[model samples]
Structure formats: structure tokens, C-alpha cells
Target: YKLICYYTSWSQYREGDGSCFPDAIDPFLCTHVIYSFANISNNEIDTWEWNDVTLYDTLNTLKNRNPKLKTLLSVGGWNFGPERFSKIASKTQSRRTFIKSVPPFLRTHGFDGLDLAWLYPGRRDKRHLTALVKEMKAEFAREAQAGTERLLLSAAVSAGKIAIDRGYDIAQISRHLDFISLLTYDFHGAWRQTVGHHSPLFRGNSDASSRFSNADYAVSYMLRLGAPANKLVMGIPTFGRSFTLASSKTDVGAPISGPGIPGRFTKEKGILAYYEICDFLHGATTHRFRDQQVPYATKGNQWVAYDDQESVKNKARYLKNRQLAGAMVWALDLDDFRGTFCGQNLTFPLTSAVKDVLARV
Candidate 1:
């Protein structure tokens, strides 16, 4: 099984003295580390600054420590939106241009692969998306034939049925890539009127409100749609989704007004890192929703739904038993990298928990 973890570039600026850097990562923990984002400009990929180039170098250099570790440059995240990718992939000429530029750029930076994270492709982009992957795969084949190191190509795909149906030609696209990172989280968040698990292992009794809103349904549906289980990597979040209750009562079906207050360290409203949540749980009441097989915490009108060590272990076991490709974390920086906040006094406790369970497989 491949344990993939995303490393965000902006995490360097997180509000904390122990801000994460490329070298801070425990190289052996992950089989692959995908750098969060590199932008696309004028139909060509580009880096934000000289520092980005430097960071890229530092990240790749970690392979010296662990020969098995591979790095990939992820391009076009949700922030880059669909317009750029749509424009580039829509035409043969534009597609060729982007495809031709990819190999050299990755090679120059010492990267082994590329991860396309174009939030989504629209319904009309079905053929264009397939064409894009096909062209890239052809290029990779040529490079291998010429005796050059072949590059890995992968895409982060949406788990929602509508998004999957409208955006992906799963069977055709799957054939071209090494794997597909299925974003199985974010099933419910601050945007919802009622509370729900952001990443539930199974569809619980309380899930009658939305049957397709759990990790199990998403993975099973994708497999039914012809996605190879061995190529589907389940995405796990190292963060929590926060919501503000409309009343004093904090129940699963309670009404919520908006997102909860931002954390002092992470400084992102509606989201809190596991480290920040650990601090919050110190003074809050935690409840394990046995029906959902997940835990959540409530402090006053603020309620945050997230996965803890127990839930993570369950998820890893589920992945191993189901024979999926493996599991991935949304980011590495969100975990207790410093090890000071969590009660266990261990760095990357959540990540450690996942590794422990999956190691047994």
C-alpha cells in the first residue's frame, strides 16, 4: 500500500513559531510526498517565487535520506480553479503545449512526477480531460523508450457523485494514471444547516438524511463506476470542520448558524488543525458518536467534527481490508508536528496512528 501525504507550500507562513519546512517531514513515514501547488500561467506551469524553487530543491533532497521516497509537483489546486485547466485542456494545441512543457520542468526540479489537481472539470470537459491524460501518458511512454526516467502522473478527483459523473471519464482516465486520490472528506462542513461527520468510515443510522455522504459510499460508488480499487487512494484529513450552533443544545441534528471561531495558531475559521483541536478538547466535552463510529467535540455553541486516533485506526483497517490503493492525508503540517499540544506528547500522533495500523497489513 502507498501512503501518500500532501505538503502544502503556504504552511511555512502558518501562525506559529514552529512553522513547518520541507526538512521537518519524517521522510520514512510516506511513500510519496506531493508538494501542494505550483501555478499555471499562460497555459504553462509556473512557480510563485524564487523561494518556491528553493523549497522544491529542499523537498527533493530528502530522498537522499530515504531512497524509496518519491516527490511530485502538484499543479492547479482549487485556488487555481477550472478556467485555466479548461482552457488548456480544451484544444489540441494548448494540450500539446502543456504536455510538452511538463517533463523538462519536472526533471529540472528533480521531481519524479506531477499531480493534476484541477478542482474539477465540467461535464463538457469529459472528452478534453481524457485527451489530456492520454497525451501526457503518450509523452511519458516516449521518454521511457528513449531511456529517460519515466514520470508518474496522477489526479486528485472529487468523491461526490455529481462531480464524478460530470467531470471524469473514470475508465479511460484511470488507464493513463498511476493512481487517483479520492477526496472522500468534506462530506459536510460549516456550509451545512445540520451537523455531520466530515469523514465517517461507514454510513451510520443517523446518515438517513444523506445516504451518499460517507467515505464508504463514495469509495463503493467509484468502484461500481469501474474505478480500479488498487488505484484509488482514500483521502484523510488531519483537520476538523467547525460549526457554530444556533442554540445552546449541541446535538447531531442541531441547527448551526455559521463556522466556529478561528484558532489562534492555524487562524482559519471553519477549519482547525488536529493540533489546534487537541488544545480545544482540553477544556471541552468530547462525544463519540457510536452510530457513526466517529468522535466530535462541543464547547458552548462551538462544535467541531473530526477524526481522532481511534477513527483513523478504523479508517486504515477499512482501507487495508477493502484492498484499496492506500490512504492519504490532506496535509502533513496540520498534524501536531511540534508534539507539544497533544496529550500524548508525540509528533504526528494522527499520522503515527495511521502508519501503525497500516504497517500491520
Candidate 2:
């Protein structure tokens, strides 16, 4: 069977009446769980306020419900970037230090494995990254040899060429991971300051352009780089990026000035972040981009675009056609809690659609 997993933040895992887990997730579907921010420098992790009791308890409870489920700790994220990785990856000793600490932390929290999320391993310190990947693989292998059941090794990779230029050697690196999650979204956004499709299939203006990077390019790139087809997991975004509208017909909107990137219908300066959008889903509507095989929509002048069940179903077909490993999402918390997408919870609707597509394939 193809492996399916869900990403979740520490806070969201523990939020609400605590029934979200075994209750909401159990019936929905998933084979693995990744708890975010376990090894980050965030205050929430360091201060022990949101750490100790809740994390351990959650892991234990989940393990009890699904003994075969694989649970991993995701170390880095988009915001954390590559600076910290440069520091840790510079020396073999530093890498060892991090690896050594993982076991004790795992034992304490009841996590089954670890997922390294360094945005770019070789990009930052190009010369020594191959060695770092080898080093980390060795560490994981040693741990597995010592008898840690289901000691999964995985990483998140960038879809852009910059990652291929600087990150770990894909061929050699593949040997170290259970699977590599290929980020397939973020193909377009306010960063461009034009009304381009967020995750379009082609490169040029609507219906008048040759193709650029899309979900297909991401999977094909990994395979070309020597990563086994079955060991590549596709990423589905639960969030959408936004841009300021110059005009409704422009097709490319400009980003709000002075901020990193512009956004639409968000509470903060530029636009709403993911959580903000989730909180305001009541005013949202979904639209499909046929060529791209993705769905997105706008609320007034503010645009919120991302993948929905239909698009995910199409991606699953791609995965099956290519004989890929499986599909994964950025995090589970961003999904709509209730059954709105496909008569099931948002997370499951997407995953279930993937399984359904895969089954047909």
C-alpha cells in the first residue's frame, strides 16, 4: 500500500477538547503523523509551556490508538530557513550532537522517528553538504541498527532549481530517506507582482503560454535526479498566497508595497496568513483552474488560492501514473475541521481522494 501522512503543529494537535485526534483523524485516514516544531529554537518548545505534558501525552495516546502508525518529529520549516542548518551542518561533531539528542527526546516524548526539514542543506554551505547528508544518514542507520523500530528518515526539498544546485546530492541522499517530500506549490504568487496563477500548468498569460513548472515538473525533476519514483511524496498546500489587485481583469496583481509579499483579505499588513484564512472560511468560495488541475478562489478584492479535493484528486492520478511513493500535506491543522470538501473532514477528503485516484490507477 502507498504510504500516506499528515503534518501537524504541536499547538493544533493539542488544541480544543483533545478529541480531534483519534476521533477526527482516525475515521478520516492516514498512515503516518508528523509533529511540527519538535527541534526548533522556538520559545514554545524551549519554555516547556507547550511542550512537556501535552506532547508526550498526545504521542502516547496516538500510539495507543494506532500502534502501527509512524510518528516523526519535523525539525525545520520555511520561516526557520537555512542559517541554523549552516551552523549545525558545518561540523561533523555538531551534526552528531543533534543526532545524539534525538533518541532521548524521542524516548521522552514517545515519537517513533524524525524528519529533517533543513530548507536547503547544500545551498547554504555547498562544499560540505554531501558530507552532512552522509553523516545524518549514518546516524539514522546506526540508530536503526540499535533497534529503534520504524526509524523513518525523511526530508522536505525545494521544487525550484536553487535547491538542486545547492542541497544534498539527490541520488546519494535518497539512500538515506524513507521518502523525500517534494514541495509542489508556490509556483506563483504576490512575489511576482502580477496576476499570474498561483499554481498554474503553463508559464504565460491565461490560455496563451507555453508550460512552466507545475506538479508534473516537480515529480519529473526528482526522478531525473535519481530519486526513486516510489520514494517521492508530493506536497499539497492547505493555504493560499495573496496579492493586491490592480484591477480585476489584469490577470496579474501587484503585491502591497513595503512588505515581503502582498496578500489579499488578510488581517495583517499585506494579506491574511493561513490561520487567518482558516478562521474566516465562512466567507470563502472555491474555484477550479482546469489547465493547472488546481482550485482557488477570491473573497471580494482579496484572493485566497490553494489546492482543493478536485485538484488533489488530479495530483493523485499523476502520482499513480508515475508510480510515486505517496502524497503528503504541509500540515493537517490548516484543513477545514468539518466535512465540507467531500463529505468527510478536509484532511481526509484530500487524502481519501488521493487513495481513490491511486486505487483506480
Most lDDT-accurate candidate = 1
Give lDDT per model, in order: 0.87, 0.60
Residue-wise lDDT of candidate 1 within 163-184, one digit each (tens)? 8889899989898999999998
Q: List the residue pairs that clash in candidate 2.
A: 7-332, 122-166, 123-166, 194-252, 194-253, 195-251, 195-252, 195-253, 266-272
State the local distance difference test value for candidate 1.
0.87
Which residue runs of candidate 1 sit more than 4 Å off their true CA positions?
none
Q: Candidate 2 residues 184-267, lDDT tens each?
A: 776663355554445553233363542445777667777887999878888766556654454554233434333223422222
User: Model 2 Cα displacement at 7 (Å)?
Assistant: 3.5
